[PDB]
Amino acid sequence: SFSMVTRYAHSPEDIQHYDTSKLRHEFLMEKIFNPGDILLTYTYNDRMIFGGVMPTDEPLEIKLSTELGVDFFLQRRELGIINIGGAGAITIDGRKDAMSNQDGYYIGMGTQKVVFTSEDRDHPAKFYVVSTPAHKTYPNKKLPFATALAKPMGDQQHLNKRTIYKYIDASQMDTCQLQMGYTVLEPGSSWNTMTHARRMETYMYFNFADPETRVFHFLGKPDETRHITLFNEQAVVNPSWSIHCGVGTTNYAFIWAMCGENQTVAMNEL
Template sequence: MEVRYAANPKDVKLYDTRRLRDEFLIEDLFPSDAVKMVYSHIDRIIVGGVVPATKPIALEAGSEIRAEYFLERRELGVINIGGKGTVTVDGTAYELDNRDGLYVGMGAKEIIFASADAKSPAKFYFNSAPAHAAYPTVKVGLAKARRVELGSQAEANKRTIYQYIHPEVLQSCQLVMGMTVLEQGSVWNTMPSHTHDRRMEVYLYLNMPEDAVVFHFMGEPGETRHIVVRNEQAVISPSWSIHSGVGTRSYAFIWGMCGENQTFTDMDHIPMAELK
């Protein structure tokens, strides 16, 4: 498990491109027949990818969290972005098609990921946050997710938000998770921008061809920076940072949040005149 430490905004002002990428960008998140995890000290989130191409893969607790099993003190959100697969939680198998999600509560001891077809393996993306109470495991298909439409073609940000792990869909301790899909011709996300000092966020960008990129904007509103992000790469966003992006074509992204509260609309909006 790779460990990333928290970053002070005063220090981030001095980072060059390589340092920004080293601290906030997660590359190579989906190695075949393996689990990749990044443990961030920002609200203790764990970001991971699992591709069980030829064999089932169990989710193990690393020495970094000093737990007997992975969800001893944590909760988990999973979204499948690959072929059909299953997540087996303490003996109960949950089939996940592409874009299906699963919430797993604290206390589940055995988590096993598997693919239905080795030629088209599942690709599981997950976020995990510390938890204080146990809630039931719930599968959330795309149809069950809470749907919110935002933006306009005129502003090049017409998009649909699918809220998978959200208080109006299911109970969780602090984890909130979902997916945003931009319509053809729309390229901006989360613009006008905002911060939410009460929780951090991670973006996984997807549905991008090889030659496409997203310019992910971060930093304090008056000291913005950017990171060039490619398909199926993730960006860690501290609570003090904006998190907006513009792509060379339309795309989707999975967002996950944890921190002080679960109120999705608790945002500190930034007037366009303040961006620099």
């Protein structure tokens, strides 16, 4: 089936008395990949659309045209995709392109038809998609995981030994506002980003080491923080006014997506 939900924006003052269940409602997407479904969220935090498409038997396309006041999905929007699942393919205005595990794609404004397929149905592909408003059309570009540039950072003393792969980066590509990346924490480290008011971020956590892994994501004003506890393959959206960092009981990975009006804190928490 197809489903897209709408979550509004808030101020720090609004959430200050939200309980645990409300925080989950306004800031957490509890399900992203369901076999045969397209699950999306529309957040008024800069009007990002994010979610997953996991085709099994029929090929799937994001069919929203009139819900956005445009003739087709990408008439005034750009799209970035990373596949965290099995062998699949996306075919763009008729031209098919095979996407391996952890391969990525950027599709620019004005692309008329984008269709997601899975090769193996019992081990389907999991396309994590992020779309943002766009005013200029830029060229489409496949980002093989082989050629994604790896940057090791962190250390063991600070429990943040990870590897950052830059996928959709302004120093390597032209896009309108959208930036995506992918961070793998090495075993024995579980800590990420440890406020920009001119942009915002959304994190999608996955690849939990063992099934009993949980992740604590922190959000809020630096001196008034809250947390949201995450299972595997869930995503949390961070407003501009909020810090964004997390801890896990073990290591994990996550895809981050960023937008705002440009493309470029301290230690006093609570």
